[model samples]
Target chain A: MMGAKMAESLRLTCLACGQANKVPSDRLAAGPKCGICGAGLITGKVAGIDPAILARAERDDLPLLVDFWAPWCGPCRQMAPQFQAAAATLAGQVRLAKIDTQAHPAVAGRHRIQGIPAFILFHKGRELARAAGARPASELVGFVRGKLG
Target chain B: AESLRLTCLACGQANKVPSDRLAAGPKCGICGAGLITGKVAGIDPAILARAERDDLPLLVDFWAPWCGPCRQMAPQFQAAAATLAGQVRLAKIDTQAHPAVAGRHRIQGIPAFILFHKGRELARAAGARPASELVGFVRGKLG
Candidate 1:
């Protein structure tokens, strides 16, 4: 049963352009890219994801890591580099993206995001777990690893 | 049902006011900081604790004296405060002096913004932006 679930195909949305793409679970390491925008699918870079892409990615079979943040927020800024590093560290193991609350308040409101630099992990359109504030890249990796494990 | 529950950024007390009166410059029953002044108040642990419980929307800026981006964003933040006056509350936290509050939020960077509504987080952003961006950000969320 576990192997059957592990081998299933997953749908992922493009963080760069809000395009939806599909990949088999086992082919996640093959370095996927957006079929529409041609952006790297699992480049391990923390880029912006609008509400559409955010929603689609959240529903993917693959685990999605989302950071809700804003400008003028010190802690959010302080955690930017670390978030990026965590992306690289995870490297296709988990999909990472950031949501700018300022840019899209409705998205934040939909999720009932109350804090800056909040992290939420989503799988199959449901929230698995969340963390508030900021942490180092190592801790972030551990956070997902522990949760996924 | 028409009243809004506001948490004091000064004393961490919950205050209830008519929703229409939010623009009337309400004051905290406990600490007396007028709510409608359109000013960005300073935040402490007590205030944060209350914010986690009460249903008030708070836009917080986490900054430090040494961060270059923080310094540059100061005036813009203030300007945004003025623009958002009487509409939403704004606050600032100095991570250098009071690292504990920022630490609790796991702030890894400086000049970050978080918007809280009803003691829960609604959104966050990083880096320095213009007053227009700041105002737009808050208005976008509230509106």
Candidate 2:
């Protein structure tokens, strides 16, 4: 009985810290910062996050795409620029981030991940789809855009 | 007869190297991964089990992906591996990937180490130590 309905409210989980912030839907392009941690909510750029950050930021009203990778992974090296470009393209639609699995060893189980350079899409606090291997920005865009519906 | 033995850290296969063939760079009979490359190989539970009991002196590092010191010490761990290649082997197992092994090994910290020789735990240590310290620890305990 205490829950209140707020129209067009978008909740974003911080990229640096897991703090949740509620913003009006139309203000997404204005670039918001997470109050708890000094991270941009929607920067249209790719930032590397650790496992703790990954766990916190996975939940959001907006979609999120995270690339699982390792430093020694060659395919990941090839896919980095493409992913960065996709981040700019997908900006307000879906946030993008990269997490190094080599440094954060526990990520293998959180996402049921098996390899490096795999992309997993999360929306509304759950993982929607995962794509494995290196891909171009067009395919990355296509993958997110296709799954949006 | 092949008396020299090595347990493959990649796939848990027991390999026999001829005494004179240690210089030849042998590969694992099962997985084809290099047997003694003087690098820290990440292992699974099965391989850890086998490697912990082999005739070769083995140093096992229990680490997780998320630990800060674990990442910082990885290069040092590898350096020690290269330095001690002929006398000992160094390998690592992910505590996060294999939580069961961490519990079984009684590992309470992120970067714990156990030195095993001839089917017994020779000594154990924890923390992110440097390459020189690791080499000293191994040499001091091993000798």
Candidate 3:
């Protein structure tokens, strides 16, 4: 499987709209566009995402880290940019996004998220691991790396 | 009843809030901003100067948007504000927006905090925060 490189493609969900598209393995760096929405798929930053988009994205083959948070939650606000920094650093390797628990309460229940700033790492549509509380960017980067490795 | 002082964070207008009227949701008669909302208010340099002289204890978080950790500490600061409401007032100012305040405060780094009580600087801390760490720090100092 790790022999060399193949024409294998990755499934990436559009952040602007919940449309899954197939992106070639090597074209991830070229700033690939979503076939449906034309939004930049590999944009290296954290964005406040709608629950619907997150719903479809989390189940894709590409790894995703979803932060379940609420604006009223203080700890959730504190961890936002740390997650942003980690997203920037781990671009192409992993995608990071946040969903407001206040906006969509049911999604939190679906993931069984118990707290603000909760982290759920999803890969190949499977729940790999989870983290709770706030942390620095370096620590967050280390987290996904530790999980994926 | 002793009168409480709250410098308006929004308009930089100094206001005197009556201790008994705290539960009344005091507001700035000038700008109609919340005087003691238990939420973090964005302060300007002028208000920050006089708020440091407030009769009530004040906590100010000096941060900039470009700073990662500063953004990280924002939530904790807000949590601290909510937790310490009415007892200790909390506010934050973006250093990038008000650069002069940074030089005046001698801020060497971002996410710096200054706790003021009774018209005097009590203690200062830089980096990381605790709605627990800051709350405990405020208690230790406020005690």
Candidate 4:
């Protein structure tokens, strides 16, 4: 189980509107948007990241940025681009991911991602830091940099 | 036995009131007030105390006999008082007569009507208000 979670860190699949999105483990924080649902594939849903996927994610040596969000939330939409913009700058260093609470609630529930747009930096199969809210690109990059190396 | 009636102080119309109607507590039949309380006396310091303590909806009117608007609004205020008698009480504080309350509440001009609820002033409108508009303001503020 642990091996699977570690492996799944690089690949991405969004349960928000059932859209499967693949992102490089290094670009997890670049704030990717879902092409199908237009949902900020980064911050909309955090708990929707399945254990099977998480197991694979934990195996990879990538910085994990999980965004928990719902569709009806306006603040989440406003922050989506910022997360994407931040993720783009931190390419190849951090992994940006999202879990859609509306589509797959269990993924978020299992991880206890309460508020929308929570950023958690995971590396070396352990959590380094967790922060909430849509922060500016500089603050986000600073936080990710502070967490990873 | 014939039912005894009391007249409203604001509007001198006799309202039929049963003897036992005020057995527990008394109020006027038309406009609610202590039965047989003849006329509304001037708003003295004691009356102000009673108004604030009872948490009654109070309308403080700033008027002077000389002003034409104040003269025109006397009847309009009385009409509003009669309409809102039971629900709220109208206190006509002549700015000329009772300058203390007027100055404290900042009566910039005459014919200002203020509505108070629970010791807190709610709404105020400058100048005179006709019956319908007065009633609307009183009802809206009291609520």
Candidate 5:
């Protein structure tokens, strides 16, 4: 009910803080944030895998990036470019994906997306770090770089 | 007056009542629930007001709507209050419209139960609790 007006609002609800926001599925590589608190969105992606092209991309051995984002969220809008920038910066090493919680309520609930703009890194089915928040281009780049190690 | 520790079976709380005033029926030092010089009993609000003016321990229950736990524990809390009626004055604050009081206590959570001594808070535990446990917690801290 809170983030209803946002374009890509998600149904993800926070248990501790009780914050519910919207997420956009089409904009996986594009990072998004929560509308209310301006926290970064959580994509919950391991590597890049476009929902439309999941099977074909799976053969490419790409590390998927899950971009968590919402529509009315100012911080989500603010961090979009950085996430896209990160995807572009890490094109070879990783892949970027997105999940709109508002559209995909069930997944968001299962993941327990408390804060927004969270980036979960995964490789070969094992999770590395589930990072949250909007960072500068340099910081986003560094985050992926550090995770690759 | 010698120090005496008496347990309240009604609420299952151990009260450190003054042994010297046991015969005088001194009130509980913690919850202000009264104890006869040697017997455990409930105190009235009128007596509690007197105790307040004279500086005594007081515990108040602050509650609100949309508070699931508070509503559930209402009966137990009230029963405890009635049991300790004269010995202590039970005060309640509703936080729905009384946002000022909530803000004053920084009550981020509902059913913010607090223990007071001489107008000072001794303990505070949020969420609703059973009467026995609440009494035990209050008595434990006061002792």
Candidate 6:
């Protein structure tokens, strides 16, 4: 038989909505859009997370880097841009998301997040790693690289 | 008697506290929330108005969610807030959500900082700065 291609499929949860989307692995870098919300799937940016979206995001095959923050927290606001910068660099490889603890205290409590601007990496429906405090883009990228590797 | 006028972040009420009692966990006269948290706080248009009208030295960051440099500088800004807290009230304005404030200040760039006191602009800087640099910038301008 001649050579055939077998493309892998990955389940990605929409950060804007709680919709679960099945996308071809190769299409991830191509910038897919959510079927439900029509929001860009791999937005090359950090997406705000609500409880419903968080549940689906945790189950995705793609690694998720979630920022637990609060509006009143100065450090959290300061780290906002750096997270976006890191997300752009991570693009299709890792999903960047944020949850405002003040707005959604239950999520923070469930995650046992005691501090603002906390970073947690989740993969395959399990917690992979965690980091606290704010960091620059370079440090964040390095952290993700080291963790994923 | 020396007093400091502060606009509450939780409630859009302006209250004056004795300068000596600023660190004594003063509460907003109109709202029960404490006056200062020793950290930078997010503010809305009402608080912005009071900050501009009052004599308190106010440092405001104009940023957007999609801007990369703005996100990078967020923590640094907070660190600066901690350093300058009780002296200056640090606040933020989302350019995307509140374009009027940005336009009024003639903000041409993202991640811009403006220092205002006594209803007049003291200095303005654009770009991301580390905590030390931010603290220095404010101190240098006021001094």
The global Cα lDDT (0 to 1) of model 4 is: 0.61
Model 6 clashes, total count: 8
User: Per-residue lDDT of A37-110 in model 1, one digit per residue for the tens?
Assistant: 78877787887878877877888767899999998899999999999999989987788899889999898889
DockQ each: 0.01, 0.01, 0.01, 0.00, 0.01, 0.01
DockQ of 3: 0.01
Off by over 4 Å in 1: A1-7, B1-143
RMSD of each: 22.2, 19.9, 20.4, 25.3, 21.0, 21.2
Superposed Cα deviation of residue A38, candidate 1 (Å):
1.4
lDDT of 3 by residue, B1-143 (tens): 78876777787677877676665556576776667779998878888888898778999899999999988898999899888988888999999999889899988888999999777889898987668988999889987
Candidate 2 chain B least-lDDT 10 residues:
B18-27
Q: Candidate 2 — which pairs collide? A: A103-B65, A104-B65, A104-B66, A105-B65, A105-B66
True contacts kept of each: 0.00, 0.00, 0.00, 0.00, 0.00, 0.00
Q: How well is candidate 1 docked (DockQ)?
A: 0.01
Error of 1 at A126 (Å): 0.5
Weakest ten-residue segment in model 4 chain A by summed lDDT: A1-10
Interface DockQ of candidate 4? 0.00
Q: What lDDT tens digits, residue by residue, belong to model 6 across residues B65-130?
A: 899999999999999988987777788989888868788888999799989887888889999989
Each prediction's Cα lDDT score?
A: 0.79, 0.83, 0.83, 0.61, 0.55, 0.82
For residue A24, give model 1's deviation from the true position in Å. Answer: 2.6
Q: At residue B37, give the lDDT of candidate 3.
A: 72
- Residue A146 miss distance in model 5 (angstroms): 95
Stretches of candidate 5 exceeding 4 Å from the true structure: A1-149, B1-54, B85-87
Worst lDDT 10-window in candidate 3 chain A:
A1-10
Task: Report how far residue A46 has shifted in candidate 5, in Å.
Answer: 88
